[PDB]
């Protein structure tokens with residue numbers, strides 16, 4: 137099939153282009169596909185790209201448009217007043233505006249299909265919505281259509297929703313094209329996906345990217361594989377990883393670093409409507425917020441993340457309990473058995489489940505997978521699946537037996553419903569990952585564990601010291617290992633905030649000198665300095681020239697290997713906005729070599745100030761390029777929940793930022 141119409145080079149300068157007598161006659165049949173290569177870097181707040189209308193008096197609501205918002209949202213309207221139909225479908229954060237000081241060419245494919253009664257929209261190869269209706273309205277069945285327009289919808293003789301942008305190609309087909317035919321449409325994409333809907337994780341959502349350059353040249357990525365929409369824990373979540381052996385050009389199929397099997401790995405399309413979006417998987421264990429580092433001495437690659445027991449997240453996590461009973465200097469995991477109201481057991485050496493009440497070992501052991509064995513025989517539980525088939529979220533047993541784990545809901549022996557940290561290690565730089573182990577508590581028996589700061593750990597350049605920053609209430613708590621991850625001690629730093637999400641990332645400015653950048657509740661990024669290689673920390677200061685919202689966002693920061701303008705350089709990645717998680721920037725800081733202060737000298741614009749940018753991972757690639765893996769959406773907004781393929785990868789050179 138050829139196009140029924142094909143246009144090219146249309147300038148949308150707040151003035152509509154009429155294409156009625158090129159298109160309307162050729163429209164026929166009830167199925168259509170719009171293919172549109174458009175640009176829009178200074179978009180109006182709301183603006184229609186393409187529009188078919190009844191332009192006559194009294195039929196203002198008789199029209200189809202493809203519209204966008206300056207927030208990056210894309211959508212369609214299919215309206216007909218005589219039929220009593222008024223369809224509106226959209227997805228936030230669907231568009232790119234600008235990459236490297238250049239308008240991005242978006243590729244839009246809208247599929248209007250009468251056989252399935254489905255309206256499907258792709259932008260840039262990604263499906264952003266797909267909606268089935270009871271009563272289908274072909275876009276060309278709207279009664280009295282007499283205008284085909286670009287850059288407005290002609291309503292009762294006047295231009296509505298005037299567009300500022302440009303259309304490079306618009307085609308229409310009297311055919312609803314196959315998914316196969318969509319993926320053969322060429323793309324000029326400024327981004328690539330490392331993790332995506334459909335890959336081997338089978339999660340439809342991803343949050344909290346990380347990136348790290350290993351010594352071999354491999355770049356490694358970790359992420360939350362988030363199953364229950366984009367919701368934090370409590371949910372189903374796994375830590376997935378992927379690596380690139382070619383400077384970011386290609387990535388390996390994702391694997392798991394940490395996983396749980398109490399709930400099935402399901403690609404689900406969450407619930408974006410207001411009655412159902414807060415549906416949140418409630419019976420599953422999960423991992424959340426990973427951080428990665430390489431150990432120089434052993435060659436190991438170390439990855440930590442938070443571990444949440446079935447049904448737990450930071451909201452309901454038992455503060456006032458670590459999950460451990462200390463016994464002169466040693467820490468043991470506490471266990472609660474079925475039918476008991478108190479925690480009567482601990483996991484002594486070799487995983488011996490020991491009864492603290494009667495002071496006797498039992499027939500039960502916990503293996504290194506935290507799986508429960510009775511007299512050496514594996515115990516199992518039945519797995520859960522999730523579905524919205526009944527019109528609300530159901531969590532129900534699915535027939536499959538999986539090894540029974542102390543973190544699960546159906547386990548005979550359960551861990552304290554609080555939050556933990558675990559580490560895994562790889563000895564092949566991310567090709568496999570050893571079974572995770574729980575870190576001991578750092579703040580006593582009567583305190584829940586700290587929360588890991590997503591991103592990178594710090595591997596000091598001239599020692600064997602590893603550091604992972606964590607946060608808790610009223611302090612930054614650095615975890616420090618001088619033995620390849622075997623042992624850990626804490627180094628506390630008081631922060632002048634109560635209930636901060638003080639997500640912290642570190643740079644080593646010169647040997648022994650660490651600057652930590654972190655999120656606060658002040659609308660500003662904070663920082664402190666150890667000159668101690670992390671033993672002691674300074675008071676808190678703030679960065680001017682960057683704004684954050686009051687709740688803040690995770691900040692990522694790296695020490696660039698090369699000199700910029702003759703100075704040592706620090707790179708920082710954050711949203712720069714007081715209005716939302718949007719207006720993302722890599723900001724380039726030159727270290728003054730005398731006092732260690734930083735002149736934040738260049739601000740690079742990742743996309744339009746109005747376009748979403750949230751958590752972010754950066755790294756210097758072996759070729760001195762910068763890799764960015766970031767959430768291209770507002771991951772705080774209750775309007776942008778549950779979007780697929782918004783965590784994206786881009787490649788930048790220093791020249792691009794300066």
Ligand SMILES: CC(=O)N[C@H]1[C@H]([C@H](O)[C@H](O)CO)OC(C(=O)O)=C[C@@H]1O
Nearest residue numbers: 344368369424425442450587637771
């Ligand atoms: C452990 C955990 O739940 N971390 C989540 C964190 C946390 O909820 C904080 O308390 C509120 O910002 O919030 C966010 C966020 O997008 O802001 C992401 C994290 O994955």
